[PDB]
């Protein structure tokens, strides 16, 4: 194969410009391999299949392929949220893994907005004005004043439900309960409960949601949460699957939890990574795709690809050709 690029003498044509990236090189050929991989992934889902619920304790019809998705907290409050909502509203994914910061940020966005800002600003001055900093974004301190006024009754009712009727609470269930209360067609966790897509987040205590739990404890004590039940659900969601795929959009615990789930079934069959980490430190976040096959988390027949770029400038473009051109096919 030769190496060519867009001529640009034919006029601006967007269909060809994003299709000519596959023969440019460097990070462009990685993008082409990624789009080819994801396009190959969806084609298997549409094939018809022609009991299982009791074994997996889940209310959902098994499809030809189950797609796993995960994201890091800083991505949710970065404007990517519209793409995730589009991916979830119509069934296109089956498992979501996040961090407590993600749910904390996503819930408030339905109640109050977030404003832009600049990268270099001293925090000493910003603290007096009452402005917090998250990257290049700035959030007000007034925003956190309505969450405290809205979450306490839910926890009161949860404690009452635990004491009165038999129920044991798991992180996969507290998320679902919050969704029905928000009652809004623009929050991604509202559509999660409607179409029965479970959400997992083992590190739920750490975050601003933890702060609310601590204060409540010294007035109505007794709340209980268990993390051993979620493991069973996530593992049996992958053991009994015909074929699987992974789309990990950031490094951290989300990468470890998703990959380790597929270990019990001799790896996945298609995968793609998008993160900006490094490998010389040896951190799991920066591990190359070929490192996964050593542990037995990515089958030896697949061809994983990994793109080094910020998720903001790549993810919206990737969903433009793969998942949007076949909307009528669902």
């Amino acid at each position: 194969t030769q190496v060519r690029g867009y001529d640009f003498n034919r006029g601006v044509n967007y269909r060809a410009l994003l299709e000519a990236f596959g023969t440019t090189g460097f990070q462009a050929t990685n993008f082409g391999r990624a789009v080819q991989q994801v396009n190959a992934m969806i084609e298997k889902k549409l094939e018809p299949l022609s009991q299982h619920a009791d074994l997996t304790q889940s209310r959902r019809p098994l499809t030809s392929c189950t797609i796993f998705l995960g994201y890091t907290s800083n991505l949710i409050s970065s404007g990517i949220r519209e793409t995730i909502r589009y991916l979830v509203q119509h069934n296109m994914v089956d498992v979501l893994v996040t961090t407590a910061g993600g749910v904390e940020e996503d819930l408030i966005k339905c109640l109050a907005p977030t404003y832009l800002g600049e990268f270099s600003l001293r925090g000493k001055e910003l603290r007096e004005n009452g402005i917090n900093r998250i990257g290049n974004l700035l959030v007000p301190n007034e925003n956190y004043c309505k969450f405290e006024d809205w979450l306490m009754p839910i926890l009161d009712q949860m404690v009452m439900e635990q004491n009165t009727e038999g129920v044991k609470w798991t992180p996969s269930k507290m998320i679902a309960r919050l969704g029905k209360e928000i009652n809004n067609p623009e929050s991604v966790y509202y559509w999660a409960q409607k179409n029965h897509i479970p959400v997992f987040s083992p590190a739920l205590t750490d975050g601003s949601l933890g702060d609310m739990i601590f204060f409540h404890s010294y007035k109505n004590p007794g709340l209980v949460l268990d993390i051993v039940e979620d493991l069973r659900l996530i593992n049996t969601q992958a053991i009994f699957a015909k074929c699987t795929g992974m789309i990990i959009l950031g490094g951290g615990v989300v990468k470890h939890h998703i990959a380790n789930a597929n270990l019990m079934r001799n790896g996945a069959d298609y995968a793609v990574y998008i993160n900006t980490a490094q490998e010389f430190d040896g951190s799991d976040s920066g591990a190359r795709p070929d490192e996964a096959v050593s542990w037995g988390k990515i089958r030896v027949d697949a061809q994983p690809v990994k793109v080094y770029a910020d998720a903001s400038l790549v993810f919206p473009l990737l969903v433009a050709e793969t998942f949007a051109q076949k909307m009528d096919a669902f």
Binding site: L55, I239, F240, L263, M264, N266, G296
Partner: protein
Amino acid sequence: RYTNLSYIGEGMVCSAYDNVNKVRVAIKKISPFEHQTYCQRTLREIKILLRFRHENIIGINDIIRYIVQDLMETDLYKLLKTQHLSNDHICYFLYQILRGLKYIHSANVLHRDLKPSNLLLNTTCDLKICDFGLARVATEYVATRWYRAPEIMLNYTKSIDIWSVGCILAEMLSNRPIFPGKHYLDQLNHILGILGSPSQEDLNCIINLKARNYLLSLPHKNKVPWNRLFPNADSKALDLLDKMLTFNPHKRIEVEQALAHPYLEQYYDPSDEPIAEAPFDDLPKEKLKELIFEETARFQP
């Protein structure tokens, strides 16, 4: 009597020398009184070893109320770790491990966990069997699942020892072991992948409901020819290994046919191999100790 006290390893085994017997042996300390489960192993071990008798199977000569048995230089683990093997040596080692298997099976006793760490060797180039504690008459935790039978792994006939010896033979032929795993599902996956998909005719004996469903809900994979896995072996070796490693428990190679296989037919004489002279629980504590004392009563002045 006892002198030349030294160190071997760790109960605990140490070097010793009997002045009266003028022979060199090893002594191992056993303390199973703490747990009935440990005592169950102890009761079977004293009973099983004492009643048996044969050249290849290890023996017990005295008990110091502290067990007196002969000592070997090293086991198969270290030799396989350091030195590679040759055709004649592999042949000799296989003919003897099988000769022992014939007596134990003829003795109508079921063995388990027949891993190479329980096979011993000395300077005279001979092999022996040592450990016999977890055994039964034809949720138990085993040290290693690497060399276990799959109908045990997935919830007992005589095929399990044949499976074990086949695994040892393959591990002798190829430097690395054949079926390495970490999780129970991991080992199941490796075994199924290497040996090929289970056919429905094969899937009749298995009775566990969930396991049967799992094994049914699988894709189809093609069996790998043994020549591809081993490019520097003998055709007879490949044939014998393929016949030994069989998924069907009711249809697999029996011990007598294996000894007379063409590979080992050169050192096999029908008159030579012997047969057993004689054909072959609850939770007590106090009377269990009494039975232990009664069994061990003969080995003291």
